[PDB]
Enzyme design. Structure first.
Site, PDB file in Angstrom:
ATOM      1  CG  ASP A  35      -1.819   0.911   1.449  1.00  0.00           C
ATOM      2  OD1 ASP A  35      -2.335   1.504   0.262  1.00  0.00           O
ATOM      3  OD2 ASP A  35      -2.745   0.857   2.342  1.00  0.00           O
TER       4      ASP A  35
ATOM      5  CG  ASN B 148       2.048   1.567  -5.396  1.00  0.00           C
ATOM      6  OD1 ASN B 148       1.558   0.396  -5.937  1.00  0.00           O
ATOM      7  ND2 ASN B 148       3.103   1.450  -4.425  1.00  0.00           N
TER       8      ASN B 148
ATOM      9  NE  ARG C 131      -4.794   6.418  -7.268  1.00  0.00           N
ATOM     10  CZ  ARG C 131      -4.592   6.247  -6.027  1.00  0.00           C
ATOM     11  NH1 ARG C 131      -4.180   7.037  -5.137  1.00  0.00           N
ATOM     12  NH2 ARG C 131      -4.725   4.879  -5.890  1.00  0.00           N
TER      13      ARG C 131
ATOM     14  CG  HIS D 233      -0.528   1.864  -9.401  1.00  0.00           C
ATOM     15  ND1 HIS D 233      -0.514   1.574  -7.911  1.00  0.00           N
ATOM     16  CD2 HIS D 233      -1.819   2.501  -9.578  1.00  0.00           C
ATOM     17  CE1 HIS D 233      -1.533   2.000  -7.380  1.00  0.00           C
ATOM     18  NE2 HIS D 233      -2.415   2.326  -8.436  1.00  0.00           N
TER      19      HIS D 233
ATOM     20  CB  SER E 293      -8.649  -6.247  -3.347  1.00  0.00           C
ATOM     21  OG  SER E 293      -9.338  -5.074  -3.536  1.00  0.00           O
TER      22      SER E 293
ATOM     23  CD1 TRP F 106     -13.007  -6.289  -9.453  1.00  0.00           C
ATOM     24  CD2 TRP F 106     -12.487  -5.382 -11.356  1.00  0.00           C
ATOM     25  NE1 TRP F 106     -12.164  -7.403  -9.955  1.00  0.00           N
ATOM     26  CE2 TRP F 106     -11.890  -6.689 -11.289  1.00  0.00           C
ATOM     27  CE3 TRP F 106     -12.202  -4.771 -12.613  1.00  0.00           C
ATOM     28  CZ2 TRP F 106     -11.230  -7.432 -12.471  1.00  0.00           C
ATOM     29  CZ3 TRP F 106     -11.641  -5.516 -13.661  1.00  0.00           C
ATOM     30  CH2 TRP F 106     -11.094  -6.711 -13.516  1.00  0.00           C
TER      31      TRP F 106
ATOM     32  CG  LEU G 233      10.240 -16.636  -3.254  1.00  0.00           C
ATOM     33  CD1 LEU G 233       9.477 -16.613  -2.046  1.00  0.00           C
ATOM     34  CD2 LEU G 233      10.712 -15.205  -3.777  1.00  0.00           C
TER      35      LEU G 233
HETATM   36  C1  LIG Z   1       1.316  -8.164  -9.665  1.00  0.00           C
HETATM   37  C2  LIG Z   1       2.269  -7.517 -10.708  1.00  0.00           C
HETATM   38  C3  LIG Z   1       3.465  -8.129 -11.532  1.00  0.00           C
HETATM   39  C4  LIG Z   1       2.270  -5.925 -10.962  1.00  0.00           C
HETATM   40  C5  LIG Z   1       1.264  -5.142 -10.366  1.00  0.00           C
HETATM   41  C6  LIG Z   1       2.039  -4.532  -9.118  1.00  0.00           C
HETATM   42  C7  LIG Z   1       1.088  -3.242  -8.588  1.00  0.00           C
HETATM   43  C8  LIG Z   1       1.934  -2.041  -8.272  1.00  0.00           C
HETATM   44  C9  LIG Z   1      -0.313  -3.414  -8.256  1.00  0.00           C
HETATM   45  C10 LIG Z   1      -0.983  -2.306  -7.600  1.00  0.00           C
HETATM   46  C11 LIG Z   1      -0.876  -2.932  -6.077  1.00  0.00           C
HETATM   47  C12 LIG Z   1      -2.180  -2.078  -5.326  1.00  0.00           C
HETATM   48  C13 LIG Z   1      -3.549  -2.187  -5.535  1.00  0.00           C
HETATM   49  C14 LIG Z   1      -1.421  -1.230  -4.313  1.00  0.00           C
HETATM   50  C15 LIG Z   1      -2.183  -0.414  -3.289  1.00  0.00           C
HETATM   51  S1  LIG Z   1      -1.388   1.023  -3.358  1.00  0.00           S
HETATM   52  P1  LIG Z   1      -2.837   2.263  -3.345  1.00  0.00           P
HETATM   53  O1  LIG Z   1      -3.276   2.656  -4.745  1.00  0.00           O
HETATM   54  O2  LIG Z   1      -4.072   1.840  -2.322  1.00  0.00           O
HETATM   55  O3  LIG Z   1      -2.233   3.653  -2.920  1.00  0.00           O
HETATM   56  P2  LIG Z   1      -2.505   4.828  -1.771  1.00  0.00           P
HETATM   57  O4  LIG Z   1      -3.519   4.081  -0.668  1.00  0.00           O
HETATM   58  O5  LIG Z   1      -3.656   5.697  -2.651  1.00  0.00           O
HETATM   59  O6  LIG Z   1      -1.493   5.623  -1.244  1.00  0.00           O
HETATM   60 MG   LIG Z   2      -4.241   2.308  -0.449  1.00  0.00          MG
END
Ligand SMILES: CC(C)=CCC/C(C)=C/CC/C(C)=C/CSP(=O)(O)OP(=O)(O)O
Ligand SMILES: [Mg+2]
Length: 236
Positions: free
Chosen positions: A15, A17, A28, A32, A60, A64, A126
């Protein structure tokens, strides 16, 4: 670190990003992109210290609700990640897996992940597990529907259902439950991640935003973990 007490399974909620990009007045999605890069640093040190399983909360079943441009960008990141990093994952003996309803992803994302699963299928190092389009409530609903059909089709009643039977029907049936759940950014909640499996997990709520979480910070988390006294309902 106590090398005899490395957790076998660490689960991480990545969390922060969005906030990391907003601090820098960047969109944003830039956060990511940097968070997908940070996954490579963490996979490296988890493998090097001998963590057996690393589950990362990538998207999650509630995510969506977010703007479609952000959803499409996240859903495309795995193609980029595997393109540049798959050769090293093969070489480092990592095995790529997923949990979640991975059928709802873009086709090109499915193909890239399936290729990575196939190219690392016999690797014994791993297990790098991406929870993509995953939520603990939906995981249980799906496992429950499977169990209801399996028992009726085997001529069984529900007396055979116990905690162990449910463990063996979840998407995590081949993994032990994580000893340690780490969440970055500061938030103190589990947001539908592995809700059955974390029943006795240790939690660490690390204050760095995900793109700033690095090897040193992972080692500090494992050191904290090693200081925890786990009781499982009993006396120490
Ligand atoms: C699986 C793969 C190989 C690549 C995907 C990698 C990534 C970066 C997935 C996004 C991960 C998420 C939903 C992070 C929540 S940060 P947030 O958006 O909730 O940040 P904030 O709470 O707004 O600070
Ligand atoms: Mg978040």
């Amino acid at each position: 670190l106590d090398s005899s007490n490395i957790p076998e399974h660490i689960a991480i909620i990545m969390d922060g990003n969005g906030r990391w990009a907003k601090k820098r007045k960047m969109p944003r999605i830039k956060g990511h992109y940097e968070g997908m890069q940070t996954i490579k640093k963490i996979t490296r040190i988890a493998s090097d210290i001998g963590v057996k399983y690393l589950t990362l909360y990538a998207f999650s079943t509630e995510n969506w609700s977010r703007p479609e441009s952000e959803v499409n960008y996240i859903m495309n990141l795995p193609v980029n990640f595997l393109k540049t990093f798959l050769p090293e994952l093969i070489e480092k003996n990592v095995k790529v897996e997923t949990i979640g309803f991975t059928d709802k992803l873009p086709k090109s994302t499915i193909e890239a992940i399936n290729n990575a699963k196939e190219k690392t299928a016999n690797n014994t190092g791993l297990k790098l597990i991406f929870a993509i389009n995953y939520g603990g409530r939906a995981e249980l609903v799906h496992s429950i529907k499977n169990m209801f059909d399996e028992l009726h089709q085997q001529g069984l009643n529900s007396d055979i259902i116990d905690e162990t039977y449910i463990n063996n029907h979840l998407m995590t049936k081949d993994y032990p439950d994580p000893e340690l759940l780490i969440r970055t950014s500061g938030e103190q909640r589990i947001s539908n991640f592995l809700i059955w499996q974390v029943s006795y997990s240790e939690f660490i709520f690390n204050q760095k935003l995900w793109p700033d979480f690095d090897e040193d910070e992972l080692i500090k988390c494992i050191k904290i973990y090693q200081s925890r006294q786990r009781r499982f309902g009993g006396l120490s």
